[PDB]
Amino acid sequence: DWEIPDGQITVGQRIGSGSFGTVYKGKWHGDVAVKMLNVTAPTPQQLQAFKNEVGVLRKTRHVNILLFMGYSTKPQLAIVTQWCEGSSLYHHLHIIETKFEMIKLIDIARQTAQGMDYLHAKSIIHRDLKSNNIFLHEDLTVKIGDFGLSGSILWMAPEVIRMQDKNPYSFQSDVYAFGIVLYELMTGQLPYSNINNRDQIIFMVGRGYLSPDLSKVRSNCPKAMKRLMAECLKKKRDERPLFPQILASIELLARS
């Protein structure tokens, strides 16, 4: 069972915080990460967000999904997961401008798809796939998670970005996001960098007037990869491949 015995978790340095939790590097049978509700005596809504994350996490045992280790309630609500050295894909691509070789870029995309495939098989829609939620453990293994606490607009499918009433999230919207991550990998940059207006991007992606510029993908990038990416970014929801297909396609070209 996953309730950690009372008073075992030690909190160390603070990493990040926000309305929906505070994160520390901690100690529990070695290095762990700890997500704590800091101000205690919680809302029935905070208690629900806790129960919801624990419900999803306790379903996941996979190398490409951050390792949930257990939870606690005393003295306060907490989620314990493995500690990872390294940094997010976003940080590597867009802040320190790491230049991976092509065979490694494909490896990163494969692992992300392994992970996505797994979540979908357990009926989990990520809802927020972006390169910042793809961690590079020792810059080697990929760990998917939700590392945050409308900074995900760039990865939003037109159905999502359009702010429709009826829930717009599906397996296919996650795929769209994956397609943008692929663009990020293959072009080394973020889409729509020549537009400085957020409302304008929202409006244009949403109406289908604006789409990522696929001619920016490097020449050493396999033609079957560029194809897969375009297939992933299709404006029609159901034309987009599902994750078993994507994985199969990536593992196919991964041979050449």
Ligand SMILES: Cc1ccc2c(Nc3ccc(Cl)cc3)nccc2c1Nc1ncccc1-c1ncnc2nc[nH]c12
């Ligand atoms: C303590 C904690 C709790 C839950 C997390 C989480 N939840 C989650 C929810 C849904 C699904 Cl499908 C998968 C995962 N996703 C990512 C990170 C989570 C996390 N850890 C972090 N949270 C914020 C910022 C940094 C880290 C973090 N975690 C480990 N190693 C790290 N190394 C640097 N930062 C690290």
